[PDB]
Design an enzyme around this catalytic site. Sequence first.
Site, PDB file in Angstrom:
ATOM      1  N   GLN D  10       0.824  -1.207   0.000  1.00  0.00           N
ATOM      2  CA  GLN D  10       0.000   0.000   0.000  1.00  0.00           C
ATOM      3  C   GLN D  10       0.861   1.260   0.000  1.00  0.00           C
ATOM      4  OE1 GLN D  10      -2.196   2.772  -0.195  1.00  0.00           O
ATOM      5  NE2 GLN D  10      -3.667   1.191   0.402  1.00  0.00           N
ATOM      6  N   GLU D  70      -4.294  -7.084  -2.244  1.00  0.00           N
ATOM      7  CA  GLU D  70      -5.562  -6.397  -2.043  1.00  0.00           C
ATOM      8  C   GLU D  70      -5.862  -5.518  -3.254  1.00  0.00           C
ATOM      9  OE1 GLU D  70      -4.863  -4.422   1.637  1.00  0.00           O
ATOM     10  OE2 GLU D  70      -2.895  -3.678   1.013  1.00  0.00           O
ATOM     11  N   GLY D 143       2.402  -6.513   5.113  1.00  0.00           N
ATOM     12  CA  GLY D 143       2.430  -7.890   4.666  1.00  0.00           C
ATOM     13  C   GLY D 143       2.852  -8.034   3.221  1.00  0.00           C
ATOM     14  N   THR D 144       2.352  -7.149   2.359  1.00  0.00           N
ATOM     15  CA  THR D 144       2.765  -7.181   0.961  1.00  0.00           C
ATOM     16  C   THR D 144       4.172  -6.622   0.790  1.00  0.00           C
ATOM     17  OG1 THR D 144       0.457  -6.947   0.282  1.00  0.00           O
ATOM     18  CG2 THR D 144       2.145  -6.497  -1.363  1.00  0.00           C
ATOM     19  N   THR D 178       1.039   1.839  13.494  1.00  0.00           N
ATOM     20  CA  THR D 178      -0.339   1.472  13.189  1.00  0.00           C
ATOM     21  C   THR D 178      -0.456  -0.025  12.950  1.00  0.00           C
ATOM     22  OG1 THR D 178       0.012   2.028  10.864  1.00  0.00           O
ATOM     23  CG2 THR D 178      -0.935   3.731  12.281  1.00  0.00           C
ATOM     24  N   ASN D 205       7.670   7.743   8.901  1.00  0.00           N
ATOM     25  CA  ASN D 205       6.530   8.648   8.897  1.00  0.00           C
ATOM     26  C   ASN D 205       6.595   9.621  10.064  1.00  0.00           C
ATOM     27  OD1 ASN D 205       4.752   7.402   6.613  1.00  0.00           O
ATOM     28  ND2 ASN D 205       5.301   5.660   7.916  1.00  0.00           N
ATOM     29  N   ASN D 227       3.837  11.500   0.776  1.00  0.00           N
ATOM     30  CA  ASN D 227       4.082  10.923  -0.540  1.00  0.00           C
ATOM     31  C   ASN D 227       4.587  11.979  -1.517  1.00  0.00           C
ATOM     32  OD1 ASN D 227       1.074   9.038   0.036  1.00  0.00           O
ATOM     33  ND2 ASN D 227       3.184   8.469   0.527  1.00  0.00           N
ATOM     34  N   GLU D 253      27.753   5.330 -10.240  1.00  0.00           N
ATOM     35  CA  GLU D 253      28.559   6.179  -9.376  1.00  0.00           C
ATOM     36  C   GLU D 253      27.977   6.292  -7.977  1.00  0.00           C
ATOM     37  OE1 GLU D 253      27.919   9.426  -8.038  1.00  0.00           O
ATOM     38  OE2 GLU D 253      29.914   9.465  -7.127  1.00  0.00           O
TER      39      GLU D 253
HETATM   40  N1  LIG Z   1       4.808   7.480   5.319  1.00  0.00           N
HETATM   41  C1  LIG Z   1       3.859   6.776   4.710  1.00  0.00           C
HETATM   42  N2  LIG Z   1       3.526   5.539   5.203  1.00  0.00           N
HETATM   43  C2  LIG Z   1       2.565   4.804   4.609  1.00  0.00           C
HETATM   44  C3  LIG Z   1       1.895   5.269   3.499  1.00  0.00           C
HETATM   45  N3  LIG Z   1       1.005   4.323   3.139  1.00  0.00           N
HETATM   46  C4  LIG Z   1       1.104   3.278   3.994  1.00  0.00           C
HETATM   47  N4  LIG Z   1       2.068   3.575   4.913  1.00  0.00           N
HETATM   48  C5  LIG Z   1       2.569   2.781   6.044  1.00  0.00           C
HETATM   49  O1  LIG Z   1       2.827   1.436   5.709  1.00  0.00           O
HETATM   50  C6  LIG Z   1       2.837   0.728   6.926  1.00  0.00           C
HETATM   51  C7  LIG Z   1       2.649  -0.762   6.706  1.00  0.00           C
HETATM   52  O2  LIG Z   1       2.057  -1.007   5.455  1.00  0.00           O
HETATM   53  P1  LIG Z   1       0.514  -1.442   5.419  1.00  0.00           P
HETATM   54  O3  LIG Z   1      -0.376  -0.279   5.776  1.00  0.00           O
HETATM   55  O4  LIG Z   1       0.298  -2.603   6.355  1.00  0.00           O
HETATM   56  O5  LIG Z   1       0.267  -1.896   3.901  1.00  0.00           O
HETATM   57  P2  LIG Z   1       1.201  -3.017   3.232  1.00  0.00           P
HETATM   58  O6  LIG Z   1       2.656  -2.646   3.350  1.00  0.00           O
HETATM   59  O7  LIG Z   1       0.780  -3.189   1.795  1.00  0.00           O
HETATM   60  O8  LIG Z   1       0.909  -4.391   4.011  1.00  0.00           O
HETATM   61  P3  LIG Z   1      -0.531  -5.089   3.895  1.00  0.00           P
HETATM   62  O9  LIG Z   1      -1.525  -4.078   3.390  1.00  0.00           O
HETATM   63  O10 LIG Z   1      -0.961  -5.593   5.247  1.00  0.00           O
HETATM   64  O11 LIG Z   1      -0.435  -6.248   2.939  1.00  0.00           O
HETATM   65  C8  LIG Z   1       1.727   1.345   7.754  1.00  0.00           C
HETATM   66  O12 LIG Z   1       2.112   1.410   9.105  1.00  0.00           O
HETATM   67  C9  LIG Z   1       1.584   2.744   7.197  1.00  0.00           C
HETATM   68  O13 LIG Z   1       1.955   3.684   8.173  1.00  0.00           O
HETATM   69  C10 LIG Z   1       2.221   6.515   2.990  1.00  0.00           C
HETATM   70  O14 LIG Z   1       1.639   6.954   2.002  1.00  0.00           O
HETATM   71  N5  LIG Z   1       3.203   7.265   3.600  1.00  0.00           N
HETATM   72 MG   LIG Z   2      -1.360  -4.950   1.684  1.00  0.00          MG
END
Ligand SMILES: Nc1nc2c(ncn2[C@@H]2O[C@H](COP(=O)(O)OP(=O)(O)OP(=O)(O)O)[C@@H](O)[C@H]2O)c(=O)[nH]1
Ligand SMILES: [Mg+2]
Lengths: 176, 50, 48, 436, 426, 426
Positions: D10, D70, D143-144, D178, D205, D227, D253
């Site tokens: 994500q 997802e 997880g991903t 989170t 973050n 982002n 480099e």
């Molecule tokens: N700084 C920042 N963190 C993000 C952003 N989007 C997601 N995260 C972080 O990514 C961390 C872990 O990723 P997830 O939200 O679980 O999503 P994922 O990495 O795809 O893992 P799963 O969805 O469970 O398969 C979370 O704690 C969020 O804080 C973003 O746009 N900016």
């Molecule tokens: Mg995911």
Amino acid sequence: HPRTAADFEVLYNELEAWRLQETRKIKEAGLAKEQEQQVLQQLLHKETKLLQTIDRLKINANQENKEARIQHTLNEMSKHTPFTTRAKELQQLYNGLNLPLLTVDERLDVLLHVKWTVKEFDCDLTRELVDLIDREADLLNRGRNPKMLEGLRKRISSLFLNFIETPEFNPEAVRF
Amino acid sequence: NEAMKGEIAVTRRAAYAAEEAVQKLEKQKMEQDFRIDTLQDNLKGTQQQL
Amino acid sequence: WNQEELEQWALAERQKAEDNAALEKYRHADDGKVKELTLALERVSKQV
Amino acid sequence: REVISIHIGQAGIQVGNACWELYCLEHGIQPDGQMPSDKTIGGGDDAFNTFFSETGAGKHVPRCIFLDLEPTVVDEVRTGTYRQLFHPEQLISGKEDAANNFARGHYTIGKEIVDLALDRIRKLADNCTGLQGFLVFNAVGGGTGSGLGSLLLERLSVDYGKKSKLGFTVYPSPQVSTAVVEPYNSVLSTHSLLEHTDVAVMLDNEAIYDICRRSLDIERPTYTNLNRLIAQVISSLTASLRFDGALNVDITEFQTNLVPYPRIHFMLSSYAPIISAEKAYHEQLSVAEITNAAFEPASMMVKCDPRHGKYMACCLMYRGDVVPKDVNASVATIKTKRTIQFVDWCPTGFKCGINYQPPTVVPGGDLAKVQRAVCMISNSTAIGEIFSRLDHKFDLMYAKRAFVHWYVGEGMEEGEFSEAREDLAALEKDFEEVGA
Amino acid sequence: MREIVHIQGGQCGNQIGAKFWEVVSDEHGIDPTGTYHGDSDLQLERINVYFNEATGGRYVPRAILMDLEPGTMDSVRSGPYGQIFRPDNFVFGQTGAGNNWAKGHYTEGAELIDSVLDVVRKEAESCDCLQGFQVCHSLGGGTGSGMGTLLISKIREEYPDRMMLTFSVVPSPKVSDTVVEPYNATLSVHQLVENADECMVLDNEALYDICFRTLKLTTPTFGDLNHLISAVMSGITCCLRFPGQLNADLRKLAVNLIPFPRLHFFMVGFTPLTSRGSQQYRALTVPELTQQMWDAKNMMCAADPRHGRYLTASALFRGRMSTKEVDEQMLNVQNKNSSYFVEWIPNNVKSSVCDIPPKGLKMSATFIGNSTAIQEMFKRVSEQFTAMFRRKAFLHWYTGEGMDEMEFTEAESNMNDLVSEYQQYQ
Amino acid sequence: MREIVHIQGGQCGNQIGAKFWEVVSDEHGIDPTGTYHGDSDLQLERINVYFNEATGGRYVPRAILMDLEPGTMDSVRSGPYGQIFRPDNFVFGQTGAGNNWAKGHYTEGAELIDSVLDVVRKEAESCDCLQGFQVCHSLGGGTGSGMGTLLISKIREEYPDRMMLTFSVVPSPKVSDTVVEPYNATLSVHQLVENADECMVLDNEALYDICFRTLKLTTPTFGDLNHLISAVMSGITCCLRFPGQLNADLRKLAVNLIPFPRLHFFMVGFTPLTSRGSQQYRALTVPELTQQMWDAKNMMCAADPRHGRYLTASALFRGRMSTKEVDEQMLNVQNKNSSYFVEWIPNNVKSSVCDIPPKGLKMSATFIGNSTAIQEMFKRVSEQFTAMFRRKAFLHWYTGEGMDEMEFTEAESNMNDLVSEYQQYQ
Ligand SMILES: Nc1nc2c(ncn2[C@@H]2O[C@H](COP(=O)(O)OP(=O)(O)OP(=O)(O)O)[C@@H](O)[C@H]2O)c(=O)[nH]1
Ligand SMILES: [Mg+2]
Ligand SMILES: Nc1nc2c(ncn2[C@@H]2O[C@H](COP(=O)(O)OP(=O)(O)O)[C@@H](O)[C@H]2O)c(=O)[nH]1
Ligand SMILES: Nc1nc2c(ncn2[C@@H]2O[C@H](COP(=O)(O)OP(=O)(O)O)[C@@H](O)[C@H]2O)c(=O)[nH]1
């Protein structure tokens, strides 16, 4: 390890004899009418290496002769007139500066003695001499490796020798 | 305690930086001292030549 | 304990900073001496 | 000189969605695929080669894949503003989530999608000619990002291996978080990223919240701001390849200069000047103060104090109007600064690159438009500190075997838990021995 | 009729040689279109040294451009006076190496030098009687230092009896631009001291301070930082192109300036150097030009030339003057600064004049000094190399490319011995 | 040929020298653009006593501007005839002494003299035959009184056989513009008595009185006082630049007016200073010139000569005169004022005549007297020094700046014995 110009002359002459024997062998080979010049160039480069080594030995011998002859002049400054007694005392101070100042406490003590002795005249040279003494004293008191106080110690020794090689400061220097 | 430990680490690194800077400056100082020694030796030689 | 340690390190850094300042002033004085020695040697060589 | 981007998880998907917005805005590509034929901003028909690829009648498609199990966010993009830009099949959407389960993303569900992902990545590489490496984006607390990311990094290293891999990994924060399985997923992804990622740069973050709160004066920031500014960082890093400057560099480099050891690649990022729109015309912009701001301790993208450790190699990528004399002077001043220290393992540890291109802010954004900007990437030894503060909570969790029944029922036992714990301990030992 | 082949490698070599070619082409009076516009007759008489007529006035320069990244050739072709170099002289790979001496000297040195040698051989056999090779590059880079050094070795093996002038820019201590500077510098020196005929070493902070003081430029960019070097490169080759009271070619300079074949690392100057504001308040004459030449803050090397002695020096004057006052000034400098001149050579300074000043002026000079104070520019690199090699830092990027630790040991040994013999001659 | 190099120090020195160069430029006919735009041939004959030829008739003054604040430098550059100087000569520390003698002789002097000495040495070596140095400064400010005398000491130790003629404007008791005037003046004369050679004393109170009465000016700005001082300078430096029926150079004037090596504080005037409502009325002759000369209300100092005897006097006339007339006028004055002249010195007056009067005028003269009446100007500063030293006022600003507590006592002692040595020979 040479020390005399005569021994250097001996080394030079034996090297020149070696050069002549090598080139005589090369000539009496009577072969390689095109590699002869390459062999000659290599022989000259060998000669240059050996001459540079002789130059290094000459530098070492010159420095050691300078130090030895300064000590010899200090000795001739002694061989019981009051001026000669003061000369012996200054020779003692110079030997104290010369000896490896392995101990910081004795270093400070001898610097204190020489500063007391120097501060009597104070025309022009004592300004820089006292500045250097205070520099070494401070950089030892605050705590720095004496191995890093090498050039500064050399400069103090040189300025003290220049002070000694002066008529008014050593009232016999008219001799030399 | 956490903030105090952070400050301890920062101050320790500042002290070590000061030490290394002093070491470098001392090396440069010794080189300059050699230079002064040479420029005084040449002056003495030239005076004797005169 | 941590407050004591902070006091110690602050004192050590102060000592090192003072050492650096003294060494810097020495270096500047030596540079001035470099200039004056160069000038004197030039003049004496011309007289020779 | 093209580099392909792959976006996993994500966090990676959203970061890539911001990045490709910024890139299309830069190269003037419309949000429907083709460049306008009436307005010509900028120049260089080879400027878009690195990130886009031209097809037939001016329809450009990016060299980046969006892979995720997802389907929510992926089909949100598919129905969003960027429909025409992306190739319809570069967006890979599974059926069920990995669901914070590293095992479920690495062993069971992962193995059924990486084959498709590679079968398209190699097609993209075949279309490309001057492949300069790969860039990966993943959140190691998910997880991903952890499972699928680890599997795909393994297979890409097995396949190509000889090309560079720049990874922008979102580690967790000290307190901000989170999830509850963050330490487990993070260590299980660390064990694999440490020995496969060619250059691993970290994000946080919490640190970006701090930056965007003090500088932009946005006291309540969402993920869009983070982002956007990470996209700015990536664009500043790739500006050397994409444009021309007085002193330009590239990926090869970048590794050759900032990785002193085969196993020490964990380097703090930063950007400057992070300035709002109400003070940009007040504050004076010059290389000295922007370099000082970049080196300011509370301007690191990773929430760790950099004065604790010693730098290894710093890369200052300058963009815009810069004349190397003033950057040299600023370099001298920053090296003379008292609080930062180098290590005798590296006497000269700076590197300055320059490009003749001012930064571009996306309309409706938050950053102001300026003349020049420095992106800083420095290898340090406080990453040992971040790994240690993660390891404490990981082993505390592993004491009670909490949340481990999910792993044992999904397909991994405790052997690799002990293995990854020991590996991270060895990493900490490495950093602590090298730094001092 | 004497022929110089100009090779340029790396980003530094490319930009510096581009500036040099603009200056030389302008001075001989050819427009960027490719035709000839020199009003006088002294210009056509020696175009053959740097230019070849192709068909109908298209005087293509004789030069070789070599590196591994397309951007440099793109920029050179785009820039002014860049529409004259022959495209077939853009011998060139595709990848790019970057800061890796081993990568640029072992891998790409195989699939690029195999064609660079072909281009150089064709261009050299094109002319009738060669004079030598003039190659400009850097030491702290990968595509210019390693690639250029391997080219140097190859061309020394091929053509043994030819002058070699290596305009090499060396890494700076303060001016930090990459971390592999000591590695690349030691590796390049290890072969330059073995093969290069003579190296006119240059650096960057000396030129920056020159642009600060002697010109008072406020934002000195590369466009003038390299203009100075271009002026020097044009001024060294004055006799081969223009008449004068006392001609002197590259062989003459080497004979007068190389007491031993391992003593050929020159520091270079150029006069007059003055700001545009004060270009109206100074008198252009040999007494001031010579004083500007014999200055510490005027040289183009970060070695304070008083930090030792001058083993030998050379002056090349251009413009109508008096060869009495030129010689008198040289002797005056010697006698005044007898301390900073070695003893076992009388008349350490050679002085040669020519009757043609550079375009846009009325009088000029150039200084080429082989002094032992250049030892520090190598001592700093050697100490950095020792400090870095005690830790094997950044070593894997070479060891996994093919280089071993023996190369580093040999480079350090040669560096130390040449510096030691510089110290000996003092 | 024989050379004068002009060093200006402090704000007052900068302004006075600017006006003086404005005057001399028109006396020689030089356009403020820098070119020559004169009328007569005889102007050119000795312009090498003050100028250099840069590039094609660009005559530039041989002057060095020395000061610690850039404001006065900017004002001088803005002012007329600014574009005549060499910008290289412009040297300044940009910090500012702030009328702190210790700061200007110990703190900022030690950092700016390293460059101003380099510039003056460059001018001297560009010269061939040095007559001496000309200096302009004050005795009431930090830079003028401290750094000026430090530079004077430097020059005396470097060139010990070259004169310095220095125009020192001294603090008069009732036109004081600051509070540390004696603390500065006494400390400056401490070194002026043993380093300089002709300390030409001036004060603004006498200039104010002259502008009130003789010129009948109502609102005299500093421009007119600077003009008067420039006229005196030109009157002194005229045998060096034009032919005459008799010759008296700087060395001759010094050797004639200095009986003992500690009495070199001369006091001067100028004739004819005519109000522009009486210039149309008076017919100027040699008796008129000598009348206004010996007129006590025209001397540019607050040391009335009626109270003191004259040791020596000199009169430098400019204009085709009658030498018998000039000499008999000197005799008549000497026989009339028979009590103001030393008895053991016969014919205390030396008169020189040059053939070229200043611009516009047809007859002029300059008076340079060494009398014992000047010791009032030193008594009136020694008393103030004792006044502000009795209760230690303002000492710490010098004590903490580098100076000890004994230099002030030494300065007071030298004031006392200097006044005693004028009293002895009065
Ligand atoms: N700084 C920042 N963190 C993000 C952003 N989007 C997601 N995260 C972080 O990514 C961390 C872990 O990723 P997830 O939200 O679980 O999503 P994922 O990495 O795809 O893992 P799963 O969805 O469970 O398969 C979370 O704690 C969020 O804080 C973003 O746009 N900016
Ligand atoms: Mg995911
Ligand atoms: N004077 C000058 N120096 C340059 C220029 N380009 C690069 N350099 C310097 O050359 C050194 C290394 O050159 P590099 O960029 O590695 O050459 P490359 O191998 O072709 O990439 C760096 O320290 C730069 O500061 C230039 O155009 N002019
Ligand atoms: N003749 C003349 N005297 C001036 C002028 N400006 C200032 N002064 C005098 O100079 C004195 C102050 O000297 P100051 O400028 O402080 O010397 P500084 O500190 O070295 O710059 C005052 O007593 C003024 O009478 C001027 O334009 N002409």
